[PDB]
């Protein structure tokens, strides 16, 4: 039927069976269509913010004759869902900052029991910080690459926020991923090894620059980051 990318395929696998899912900023409503068609989800909501992506999602769902189980809605983030409407929420193809913003702006729509499957393009840390604060528990993480690009997928549900971080510092865990850190797969090492190298270059770059209170502060943070990364790729 519909084919999904490795990235969204990964996301779909965490959808609880018979779950009603809400895909925020749904890409053509493919993921939700795919989930409902494969009976992974019982029903779904596909949220779009702009007119274009909205009409096109509505048309695909209509074209696919999935209007009966899929509701394409227009709105900002979780603005499209009603409290206790969905059992799983997927937010992918966005930056960690946005995802965290979406979650925070619409946490009124959350009961807390909904399973969150978040796929940040970058700065997954913003999501972990938000999750820890709203006490959620990370139940799993995956990091893979597709078409020469690495992508992370975070899965969370109500639970004990510290559990997943047992054995690792919140500081590091939140940045690289507690589960990811334990796994230490090729994609993970490559991503963070490069990040560290990039951090060192800025450190040495700022090092040669002026000796100002500002640059020394900027260096302190780079150092903290470097040591942090060093501890995760040992
Ligand atoms: Ni960020």
Swiss-Prot record:
Function comment: Catalyzes the S-adenosyl-L-methionine-dependent formation of N(1)-methyladenine at position 22 (m1A22) in tRNA.
Keyword Manganese: no
GO cellular component: cytoplasm
Major subcellular site: cytoplasm
Residues modified as Phosphoserine: 68
Source organism, top-level taxon: Bacteria
Family of this protein: Belongs to the TrmK family.
Record's keyword terms, sorted: Cytoplasm, Methyltransferase, Phosphoprotein, S-adenosyl-L-methionine, Transferase, tRNA processing
Name assigned to this protein: tRNA (adenine(22)-N(1))-methyltransferase
InterPro entries: SAM-dependent_MTases_sf (IPR029063), TrmK (IPR006901)
Organism: Bacillus subtilis (strain 168)
Source species taxonomy: Bacteria, Bacillati, Bacillota, Bacilli, Bacillales
GO molecular-function term, one example from the UniProt record: tRNA (adenine(22)-N1)-methyltransferase activity
Disulphide bridges: none
UniProt-listed Enzyme Commission number(s): 2.1.1.217
Pfam families: TrmK (PF04816)
Recorded catalytic activity of this chain's protein: adenosine(22) in tRNA + S-adenosyl-L-methionine = N(1)-methyladenosine(22) in tRNA + S-adenosyl-L-homocysteine + H(+)
Enzyme class, first EC level, given as a word: transferase
Subcellular location: Cytoplasm
One GO term (biological process): methylation
